[PDB]
């Protein structure tokens, strides 16, 4: 008997090949530039690199037999062409009979889709190779990669609730920490935008610098995620909606006017600091201790988030607040327009 996840996976891929279907091939051939060969090459490159890392031991990850790697890979390739066909068929340009060459020639989409497929398969088998293992192995930037998850969730309805939950979890992981690492492509995108961080109001309502759209979507997801977390905290801490709006305003200020604070840190660290300093200055005060016990009941919350925090060297959240956060945000805080809460 297979586990529910692996049997579900088996149901999704039943009767299908690790090659393009006739329908997909036809779409490929209606393009001025037919992607089919370059797509094969990407899967071949990804497949080889995956097998090399899978079968070799890193001291944190005992290596595993090539026959299992290939079976994992094969399954992910079947999923890839299935989801790609679904995506291409439902595309607007396809429905209007317009050439999809430019759409189909973006390498980052195909790489991300194949990685997400590999992640689906690995998860289904309860692999020890935990995200972000697959995107570090394949050299996929978190800032680019996360965008495919929502496409996958949309384009394959055969995914289980548990599979979708996992995909949402690793998107949250990217949004909260991984895309903020010092070497993330996020910083590049902000850079060509003159380090102008979009405000919540700007992205939560419908010749540009490139990555403008990428910046807008990423921060929309970030603002959306942080608002959900802040709403829960305010509920469990039973705070007025006015302090909530003030806490939100302070948090946005740190994202927009102190974005370097997020580099190599965690989104929730800035959100919890925003909570306390605003509760403090408005005399609605809650202790950081009760702030954090309320925080820890959230799904993403692990001890290291407020216990291990980057200082310059690591310390708990309180030390971060005192030696770093206060100095930067106290001018804005001591000042208590308020931002819209999503």
């Amino acid at each position: 008997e297979f586990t529910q996840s692996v049997s579900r996976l088996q149901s999704i891929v039943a009767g299908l090949k690790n090659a393009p279907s006739d329908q997909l091939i036809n779409i490929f051939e209606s393009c001025v530039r037919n992607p089919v060969e370059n797509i094969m090459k990407i899967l071949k490159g990804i497949g080889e690199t995956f097998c090399q890392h899978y079968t070799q031991s890193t001291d944190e990850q005992p290596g595993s037999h090539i026959d299992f790697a290939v079976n994992r890979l094969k399954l992910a390739e079947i999923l890839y062409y299935k989801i790609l066909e679904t995506v291409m068929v439902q595309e607007t340009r396809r429905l209007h009979g317009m050439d999809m060459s430019v759409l189909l020639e973006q390498d980052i989409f195909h790489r991300s889709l194949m990685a997400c497929c590999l992640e689906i398969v690995l998860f289904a088998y309860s692999s020890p190779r935990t995200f972000p293992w697959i995107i570090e192995v394949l050299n996929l930037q978190p800032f680019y990669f996360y965008k495919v998850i929502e496409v996958v969730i949309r384009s394959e309805e055969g995914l289980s609730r548990d599979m979708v939950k996992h995909l949402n979890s690793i998107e949250e992981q990217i949004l909260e920490s991984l895309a903020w690492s010092h070497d993330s492509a996020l910083w590049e995108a902000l850079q060509v935008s003159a380090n102008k961080v979009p405000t919540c109001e700007e992205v939560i309502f419908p010749n540009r610098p490139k990555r403008t759209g990428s910046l807008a979507l990423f921060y929309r997801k970030v603002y959306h995620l942080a608002s959900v977390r802040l709403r829960d905290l305010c509920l469990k801490l039973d705070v007025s909606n006015e302090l909530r709006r003030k806490i939100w305003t302070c948090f946005e200020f740190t994202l927009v006017h102190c974005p370097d604070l997020m580099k190599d840190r965690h989104l929730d660290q800035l959100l919890l600091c925003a909570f306390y300093i605003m509760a403090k200055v408005t005399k609605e005060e809650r202790t950081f201790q009760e702030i954090m016990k309320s925080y820890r009941n959230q799904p993403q919350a692990n001890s290291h988030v407020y216990r291990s925090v980057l200082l310059k060297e690591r310390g708990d959240l309180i030390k971060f607040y005192n030696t770093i956060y206060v100095g930067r945000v106290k001018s804005f805080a001591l000042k208590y327009p308020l931002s819209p809460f999503p």
């Binding site: 306390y276 300093i277 403090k280 200055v281 202790t287 950081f288 201790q289 216990r307 708990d316 309180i318 607040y321 005192n322 206060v326 106290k330 805080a333 001591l334």
Partner: peptide, 9 residues
Amino acid sequence: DLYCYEQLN
């Protein structure tokens, strides 16, 4: 004043 004088756990 705006500093946090609490400690942990």
